[PDB]
N, CA and C atoms as an extended XYZ file, in Angstrom:
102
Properties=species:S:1:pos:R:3:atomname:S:1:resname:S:1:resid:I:1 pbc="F F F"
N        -3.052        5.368        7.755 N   UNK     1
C        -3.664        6.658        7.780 CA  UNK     1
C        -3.184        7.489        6.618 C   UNK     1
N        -4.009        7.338        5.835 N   UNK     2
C        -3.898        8.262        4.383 CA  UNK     2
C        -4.645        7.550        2.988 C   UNK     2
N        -4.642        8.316        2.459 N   UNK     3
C        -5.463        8.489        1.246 CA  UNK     3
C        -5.274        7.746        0.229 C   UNK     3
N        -5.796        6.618        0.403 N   UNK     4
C        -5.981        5.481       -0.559 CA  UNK     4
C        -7.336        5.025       -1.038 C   UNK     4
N        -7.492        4.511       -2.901 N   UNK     5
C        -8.777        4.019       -2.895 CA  UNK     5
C        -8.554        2.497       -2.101 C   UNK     5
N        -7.908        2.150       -2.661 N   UNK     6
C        -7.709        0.609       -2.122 CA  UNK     6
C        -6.670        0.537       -1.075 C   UNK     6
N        -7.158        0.376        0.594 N   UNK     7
C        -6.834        0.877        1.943 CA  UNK     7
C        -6.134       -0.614        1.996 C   UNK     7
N        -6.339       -1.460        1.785 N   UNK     8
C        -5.582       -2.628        2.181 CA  UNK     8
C        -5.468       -3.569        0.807 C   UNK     8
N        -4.040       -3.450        0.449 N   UNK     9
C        -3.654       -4.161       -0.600 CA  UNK     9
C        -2.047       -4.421       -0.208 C   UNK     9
N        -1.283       -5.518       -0.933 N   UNK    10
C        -0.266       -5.904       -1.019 CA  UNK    10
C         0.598       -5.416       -2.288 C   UNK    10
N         1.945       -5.386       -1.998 N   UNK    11
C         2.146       -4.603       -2.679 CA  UNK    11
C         3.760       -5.276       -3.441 C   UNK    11
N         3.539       -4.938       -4.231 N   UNK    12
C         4.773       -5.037       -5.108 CA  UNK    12
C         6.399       -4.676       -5.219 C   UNK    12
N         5.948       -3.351       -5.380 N   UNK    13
C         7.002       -2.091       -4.821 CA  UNK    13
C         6.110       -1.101       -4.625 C   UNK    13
N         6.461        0.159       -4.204 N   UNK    14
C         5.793        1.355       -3.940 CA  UNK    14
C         5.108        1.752       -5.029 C   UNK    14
N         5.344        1.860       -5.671 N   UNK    15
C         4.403        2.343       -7.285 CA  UNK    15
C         3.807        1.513       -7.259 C   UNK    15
N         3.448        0.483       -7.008 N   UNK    16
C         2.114       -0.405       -7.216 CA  UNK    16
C         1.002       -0.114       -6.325 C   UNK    16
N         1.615        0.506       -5.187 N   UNK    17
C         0.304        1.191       -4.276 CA  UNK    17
C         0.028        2.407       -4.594 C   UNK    17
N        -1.300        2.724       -4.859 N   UNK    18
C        -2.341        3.897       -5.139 CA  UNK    18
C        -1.981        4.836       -4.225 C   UNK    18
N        -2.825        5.716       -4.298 N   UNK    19
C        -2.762        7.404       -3.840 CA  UNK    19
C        -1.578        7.444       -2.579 C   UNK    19
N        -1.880        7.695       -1.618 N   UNK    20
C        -0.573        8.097       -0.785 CA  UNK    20
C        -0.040        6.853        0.372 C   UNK    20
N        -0.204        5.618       -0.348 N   UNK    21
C         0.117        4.373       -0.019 CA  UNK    21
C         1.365        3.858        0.101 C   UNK    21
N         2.303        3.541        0.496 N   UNK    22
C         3.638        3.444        0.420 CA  UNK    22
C         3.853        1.590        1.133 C   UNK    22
N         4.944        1.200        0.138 N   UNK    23
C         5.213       -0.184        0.337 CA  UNK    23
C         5.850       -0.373        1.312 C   UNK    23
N         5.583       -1.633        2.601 N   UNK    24
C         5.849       -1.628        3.798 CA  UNK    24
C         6.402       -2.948        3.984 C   UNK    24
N         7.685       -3.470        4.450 N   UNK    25
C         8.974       -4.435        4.203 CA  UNK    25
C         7.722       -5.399        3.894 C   UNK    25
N         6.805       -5.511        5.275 N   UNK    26
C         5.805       -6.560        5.634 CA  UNK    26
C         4.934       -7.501        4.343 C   UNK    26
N         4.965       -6.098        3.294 N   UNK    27
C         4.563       -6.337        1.892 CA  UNK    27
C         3.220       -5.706        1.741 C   UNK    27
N         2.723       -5.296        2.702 N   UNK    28
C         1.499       -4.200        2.351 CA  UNK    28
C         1.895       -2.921        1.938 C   UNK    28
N         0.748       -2.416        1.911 N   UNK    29
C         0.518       -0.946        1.118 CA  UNK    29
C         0.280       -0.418        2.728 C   UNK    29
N         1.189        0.024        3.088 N   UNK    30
C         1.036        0.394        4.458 CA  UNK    30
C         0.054        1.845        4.673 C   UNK    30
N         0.533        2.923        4.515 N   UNK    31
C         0.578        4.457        4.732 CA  UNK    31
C        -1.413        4.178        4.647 C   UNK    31
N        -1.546        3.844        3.379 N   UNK    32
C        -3.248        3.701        3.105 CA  UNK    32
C        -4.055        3.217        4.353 C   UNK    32
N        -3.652        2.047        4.786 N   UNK    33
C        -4.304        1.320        6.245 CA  UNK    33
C        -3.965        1.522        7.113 C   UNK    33
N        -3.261        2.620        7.209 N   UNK    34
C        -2.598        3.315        8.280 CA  UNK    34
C        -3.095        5.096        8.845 C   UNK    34
């Protein structure tokens, strides 16, 4: 739940996820698909 263009992506570290996306242990871009 939040403001991402790309809502479900994997992620790198946190800076690799877009708008208010945040990197999640699991390895997604959590916050976005959330």
């Amino acid at each position: 739940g939040g403001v991402c263009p790309k809502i479900l992506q994997r992620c790198r570290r946190d800076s690799d996820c877009p708008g208010a996306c945040i990197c999640r242990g699991n390895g997604y871009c959590g916050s976005g698909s959330d």
